[PDB]
Amino acid sequence: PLMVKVLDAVRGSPAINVAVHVFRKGLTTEEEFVEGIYKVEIDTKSYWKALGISPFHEHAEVVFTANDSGPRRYTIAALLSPYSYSTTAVIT
Amino acid sequence: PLMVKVLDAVRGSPAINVAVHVFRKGLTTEEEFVEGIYKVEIDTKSYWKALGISPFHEHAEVVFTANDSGPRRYTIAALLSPYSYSTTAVIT
Amino acid sequence: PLMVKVLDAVRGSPAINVAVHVFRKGLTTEEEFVEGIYKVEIDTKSYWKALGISPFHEHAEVVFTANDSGPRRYTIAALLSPYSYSTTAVIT
Amino acid sequence: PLMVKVLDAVRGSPAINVAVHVFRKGLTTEEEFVEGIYKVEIDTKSYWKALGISPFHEHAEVVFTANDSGPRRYTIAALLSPYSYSTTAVIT
Amino acid sequence: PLMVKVLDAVRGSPAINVAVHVFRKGLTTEEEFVEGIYKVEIDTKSYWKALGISPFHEHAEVVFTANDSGPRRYTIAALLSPYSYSTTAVIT
Amino acid sequence: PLMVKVLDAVRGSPAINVAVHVFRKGLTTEEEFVEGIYKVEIDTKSYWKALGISPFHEHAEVVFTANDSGPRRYTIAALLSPYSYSTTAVIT
């Protein structure tokens, strides 16, 4: 008897992000997983990933160059921060 | 008997993002997974991924160049932040 | 007996995004997965992905160039943030 | 007996996005998946994907050039954020 | 008898991020895991990961260069910090 | 009889991040793990990870160069710090 009870009774106005999981039981491999449930990615950069079997195997001249030079701006007043009866403001 | 009960009773006006999962049981491979349930990606860059089997195998001259130089702006006052009875404002 | 009950009773006006999953049981391959349920992608860039088997196998001269230089702007006051009885405003 | 009950009783005027899934059981391949259920993609760019078997196999001179330089603007006051009894306004 | 009870009774308007998990039982491989439940990644950079079996095996001349030089700014007043009855403001 | 009870009764408006886990029972490999539950990564850089079996095996001349020189700024007034009845402000 696996019984899970979450926030069963709520009187009022709560701000919430419920996450409930119940389980009863050649290069990169994954299995039976829960990923990114509430994941938040901002300005995420992947350049060279899982290129392959035998990549650049013989006589490979390679010049790699990452030039991260940008007037970039990110302004998040509430990230994954539920809020009740409040005042949120990005004043810019 | 697998019983899961979530937010069964709500009196009022809550702001919510419910996520409930119940389970009763050549280069990149995945299986039996839950991904991106509420995932939020902003300004995400993948350049060279899973190129293939034998990519650039023989005598490969390669010049790779990433020039991330941009007047880019991202303004999110409430990301995955449910809010009840409040004031949200992006004043720009 | 797999019983799942979510938000069964609601008195009032809640703002919600319900997500409920019940399960009773050559380069890139995937199987039996749930993806992008509420995924939100903004300004997402993939340049070179899964090119193929034997891509650029012999004597390949390659010049790759990413020039991300743009006056781009993204303004989202409420992303995946349900809101009840509130005031949301993008004032720009 | 797989019984799933969601939002069975609603008294009032809630704003909601219900998502319920019940399951009782050469380069890129996928199977038995649920994708893009509520996915929201904004300004998403794929340049070179799944080119094919043996693409650019012999003596290939390639110049690739991405020039992302645009006065582009995206303004969404409520993305996947259901809202009841509120005031949403994109004032620009 | 595995009984889990979380926030069963709420009188008022709390701001919360509930996370409840109940379990009753060639290069990189993973299995049976829960990842990114509420993970928040900001300005995360992966350059060379899982290149492959036999990458640069013979006579490989490689010049790698990361130049992280950017006027980048990130301003988050509330990251994973739920807040009730308060005033949050990014004044810039 | 494994009984777990968390925050069962709440009178008022607390700000909380509940995390409850109940368990009743070729290069890098992992199994049966919970990771990133509330993990927050800011300005995290991985350059050369899991390159592969036999990477740079014979006669490899390699020049690696990381130049982290950026006018980067990160301002988070509340990271994983729930707050009730308070005033949070990033004044810049």
Author numbering:
A (entry chain D), B (entry chain C), C (entry chain B), D (entry chain A), E (entry chain E), F (entry chain F): 11 to 35, 57 to 123
Sentences from the paper on this structure:
He also showed carpal tunnel syndrome and received a heart transplantation three years after diagnosis. Yet, they exist in different chemical environments: while residue 20 is part of the N-terminal fibril protein segment and located at a buried and hydrophobic position, residue 122 is located in the C-terminal fibril protein segment and affects a solvent-exposed position. The backbone root-mean-square deviation of all 92 resolved backbone Cα atoms was analyzed with Chimera25 and found to range from 0.5 Å to 0.7 Å for the three structures.
Systemic ATTR amyloidosis is an increasingly important protein misfolding disease that is provoked by the formation of amyloid fibrils from transthyretin protein. To investigate the relationship between mutation, disease manifestation and fibril morphology, we have determined the cryo-electron microscopy (cryo-EM) structures of several ATTR amyloid fibrils, which were isolated from the amyloidotic tissue of patients with hereditary ATTR amyloidosis. Based on cryo-EM, however, we find essentially the same fibril structure in all patients, demonstrating that the mutations do not necessarily lead to different fibril morphologies. Each molecular layer consists of two discrete density regions that correspond to two ordered segments of the fibril protein: an N-terminal segment, extending from P11 to K35, and a C-terminal segment that spans from G57 to T123 of TTR protein.
